[PDB]
Design a binder for these strands. Structure first.
Lengths: 101, 108, 31, 203, 202, 52
RNA sequence: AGACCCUGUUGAGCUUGACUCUAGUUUGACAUUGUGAAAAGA
RNA sequence: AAAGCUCCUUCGACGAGUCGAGUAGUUUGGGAAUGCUGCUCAAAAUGGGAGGUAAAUUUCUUCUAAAGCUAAAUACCGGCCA
RNA sequence: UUGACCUCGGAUCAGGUAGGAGGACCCGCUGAACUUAAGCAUAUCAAUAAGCGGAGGAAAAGAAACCAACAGGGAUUGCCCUAGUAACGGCGAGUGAAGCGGCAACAGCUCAAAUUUGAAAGCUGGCUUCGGCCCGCGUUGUAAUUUGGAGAGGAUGCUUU
């Protein structure tokens, strides 16, 4: 950790204390992928397939309309970041399909 | 009381910005002038300093311990060196401290 | 219609273990 | 600005039962003390520093001790609430000073703690022997283990040769320079990155 | 454990198999009664995570409720007070259709206690829910410390007072600044704020 | 019931009034003006021994 | 203390391309809504 | 037979028509930052929510939602006793 | 043909439960108008009166998807203060919190997501000689272990019932 300057204003302001590094709290471990979760999620993907709007975004990304796919994903999902994550996940899906074929 | 009222006597004869979610704790900085600076010292030791019986020792005053954040420079200081612990200080306050022979260093 | 005393005093097994090994102790603090 | 435009008389609360409620609270406290004798009536509380820039000058009592404080004091997390020690699992020790103060507090509590055995006939090694079970005791942990020095000592003496020289340029100048750097930090990496890109382009 | 697989597949509600089963079960439940007992939960993973157990004393009731907004029961659908700049078609009930489903299931079988409920299917006209109920008079229930809290008389009709999960959601009992008015009870907080406290030595 | 029944008094004024009352209690003419029968009292203020 | 006249921050009943609404009616879209073919295209 | 402490290569499952987005009604000090409900769309895995001005990019700080229990301090024009 | 399930039924079957009263306080739902704004469709009265459903001696809330930006506090509830402040408001009458701080009282926990698989170890009911035995429920999961504060798998040597 960066040592504080001991000032009331400016960069790194605050009273000087000896900072400690802590063991990572297990509550903050959420979001990490596990082997069981990864295997189950991949198998469930193979069992179930894709949504109709997911297939539409697949078609747009195969056709090369990346901005149109991002716009359609944002319209469907409601969030630009979620649209970007869905688009990159479908890039991974298309890449795996191409490397399989 | 009813008996003192006048009714008893009258018996028979009738801009700028909008700051959403303002937290006052952000802007907490009480200020103290240098003419009240020696008042923070207890009376006996302050009397000894103003009398002049201790020539080799200088007082250190923490404003945040007394509840003040900024040292202002209204008034004049005696010729006694005083170390002052402060978060903020004004330019002529610190200048009059330098004339008095002390120093103002910053704390947080 | 109230629960019986025995059913009200039924307690879980891990709680029983923790009450067996770390119960509320009798203690005092010096002055 | 008088807010009496509603049916305010329907929800007027008077406080004639203030002495009666105080007597009731005192009777409840006396009953609690009689039930919990010889233990103190309250739990041991740590010393913590108040949040925000207004109150960080002062310390106070917290909810409970942290798990790393208990581990450094040698008290397990299951034995701790049974000997009058409050436990707070949400609070963390981000600094060494508060951690050291709280572990010293717990060590003093453990040194002053008298622990009676679960069975009188069969005492154990961690339990207090009967010849040392008798002493003058306290019943108020808030009083015996209170915050002794809540604020920093605002009156200290140093020698005149020990006077600090001070920051160069002046304290007001240092404040203004720190504020200026804080306000102008981002344009400085922006200009530095532009200069580095220009140097890479025309090296 | 297969329940993890059921969870992850039940997440994908737009897949072919899930849409097919939802369609056929919607038809079956539409042909059945509005409130009827289900012999076993059709979503075992959701029932288990909401608190159902394979023990004598747990009952599942399936229920359908008409969806949409609410209509104020005035004759000829028109109000004769001040103009409102809205119709009766745009009135919104402040509780969920899931809570209404819990109401009707509890009234149908009042000798039990509603534990929770969950969405199972929906169509244009109805929404379909399954409600878990626990019998407080069954000995296997009364001997189990994980569930015998519901045998206390304070838990009589939790869904009528909003003590189920949808009740907490509709009452807004969440910590934080976004829930300043309703985290302790809206009417209680309003009465606390509008109460004029006058002390003796004022 | 929300009429002002109680009156808040400064503690300094309370202690001042108590001091004035105790000072008046040592004045034998003020005892007569008060109306007590203190003619046979040996001394004012009257002190009795704590052993009795 | 009827009737008549005059006044009102007047009340109430009724009418109308007076104002803002609304029941009802009409139009468009979305979901309920599934299964195939035969073509036209990209 | 259970239970606690200490150390560690490693593992570490954590709640879906749910969160979120738009819209309408209602409500709020949150008519730029509130909550609830209906309709439509509809999520993810260091992910998600929040950080009271809309958005993009790079960071940081906090917790770990969509399952559940729990006394006390608090309220009391009903009933009983005083 | 004889059976085994699954689902749906019948029975004055064996054993139980709910209705109504009360409703001052409590949890919700629904919901005005007089009144104040010159009048008045925003607003105010008021998220009130009336109406409806549901508990208890308290109820509810409650152990952070919190507050903060600090040297960080640390479940819920209530009092004082914050504060008539931030903020909202036709043509303005007005409306109006929250963090921190002090106090009263303080208490922490249970599941789902894991295979016991070298042994469903779990539970309702009937008969009892009170030792137990049967009919069943349940593998579409009852026991034990774990809940993020972690825990699981090893190593280690002492402590507790």
């Amino acid at each position: 950790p960066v040592e504080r300057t001991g000032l009331i204003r400016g960069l790194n302001k605050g009273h000087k204390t000896t900072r400690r590094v802590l063991k990572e709290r297990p509550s903050r471990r959420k979001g990490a992928q596990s082997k069981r979760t990864q295997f189950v999620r991949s198998l469930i993907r193979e069992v179930a397939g894709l949504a109709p709007y997911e297939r539409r975004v697949i078609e747009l990304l195969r056709n090369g309309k990346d901005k149109r796919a991002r716009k359609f994903s944002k319209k469907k999902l409601g969030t630009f970041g979620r649209a970007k994550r869905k688009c990159e996940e479908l890039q991974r899906i298309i890449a795996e399909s191409r490397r399989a074929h | 009381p009813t008996r003192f009222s006048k009714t008893r006597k009258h018996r028979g004869h009738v801009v700028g910005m909008r700051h959403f979610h303002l937290l006052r704790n952000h802007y907490w900085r009480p200020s103290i002038n240098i003419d009240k600076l020696w008042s923070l010292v207890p009376s006996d030791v302050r009397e000894q300093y103003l009398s002049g019986q201790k020539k080799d020792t200088a007082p250190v005053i923490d404003l945040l311990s007394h509840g003040y954040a900024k040292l202002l420079g209204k008034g004049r200081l005696p010729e006694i060196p005083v170390v002052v612990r402060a978060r903020y200080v004004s330019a002529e306050a610190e200048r009059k401290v330098k004339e008095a022979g002390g120093v103002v260093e910053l704390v947080a | 219609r109230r629960l019986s005393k025995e059913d009200a005093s039924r307690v879980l097994e891990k709680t029983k273990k923790r009450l067996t090994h770390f119960p509320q102790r009798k203690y005092a603090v010096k002055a | 600005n008088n807010h009496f435009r509603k049916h305010w008389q329907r929800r007027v609360r008077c406080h004639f039962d203030q002495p009666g409620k105080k007597v009731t609270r005192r009777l409840a406290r006396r009953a609690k003390a009689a039930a919990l004798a010889p233990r103190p009536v309250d739990k041991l509380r740590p010393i913590v520093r108040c949040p925000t820039v207004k109150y960080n000058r002062r310390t106070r009592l917290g909810r409970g001790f942290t798990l790393e404080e208990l581990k450094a004091a040698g008290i397990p997390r299951l034995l701790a609430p049974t000997i009058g020690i409050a436990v707070d699992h949400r609070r963390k020790n981000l600094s060494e000073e508060s951690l050291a103060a709280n572990v010293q507090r717990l060590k003093d509590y453990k040194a002053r703690l008298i622990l009676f055995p679960r069975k009188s006939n069969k005492p154990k090694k961690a339990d207090t022997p009967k010849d040392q079970q008798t002493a003058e005791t306290t019943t108020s942990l808030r009083t015996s283990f209170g915050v002794e020095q809540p604020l920093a000592p605002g009156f200290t003496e140093i020698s005149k040769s020990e006077i600090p020289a001070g920051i160069e340029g002046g304290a007001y100048r240092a404040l203004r320079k720190a504020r200026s750097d804080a306000r102008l930090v981002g344009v400085r990496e922006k200009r530095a990155k532009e200069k580095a890109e220009a140097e890479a382009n025309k090296k | 454990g297969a329940l993890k697989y059921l969870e992850e597949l039940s997440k994908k509600k737009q897949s072919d198999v899930v849409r097919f089963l939802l369609r056929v079960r919607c038809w079956e439940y539409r042909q059945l009664n509005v409130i009827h007992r289900a012999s076993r939960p059709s979503r075992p993973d959701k029932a288990r995570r909401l608190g159902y157990k394979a023990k004598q004393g747990y009952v599942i009731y399936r229920v359908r409720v008409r969806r949409g907004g609410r209509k104020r029961p005035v004759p000829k659908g028109a109000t004769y007070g001040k103009p409102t700049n809205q119709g009766v078609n745009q009135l919104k009930y402040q509780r969920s259709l899931r809570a209404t489903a819990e109401e009707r299931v509890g009234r149908r079988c009042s000798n039990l206690r509603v534990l929770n409920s969950y969405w199972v299917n929906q169509d244009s006209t109805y929404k379909y829910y399954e409600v878990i109920l626990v019998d407080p008079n069954h000995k296997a229930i009364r001997r189990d410390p994980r569930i015998n809290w519901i045998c206390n008389p304070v838990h009589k009709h939790r869904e009528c007072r909003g003590l189920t999960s949808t009740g907490k959601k509709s009452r807004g009992l969440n910590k934080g600044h976004r829930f300043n008015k309703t985290r302790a009870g809206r009417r209680k907080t309003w009465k606390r704020h509008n109460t004029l406290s006058l002390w003796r030595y004022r | 019931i929300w009429r002002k029944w109680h009156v808040k008094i400064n503690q300094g004024q309370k202690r001042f009034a108590t001091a004035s009352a105790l000072a008046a209690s040592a004045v034998a003419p003020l005892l007569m003006a008060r109306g007590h029968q203190v003619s046979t009292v040996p001394e004012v203020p009257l002190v009795v021994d704590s052993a009795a």
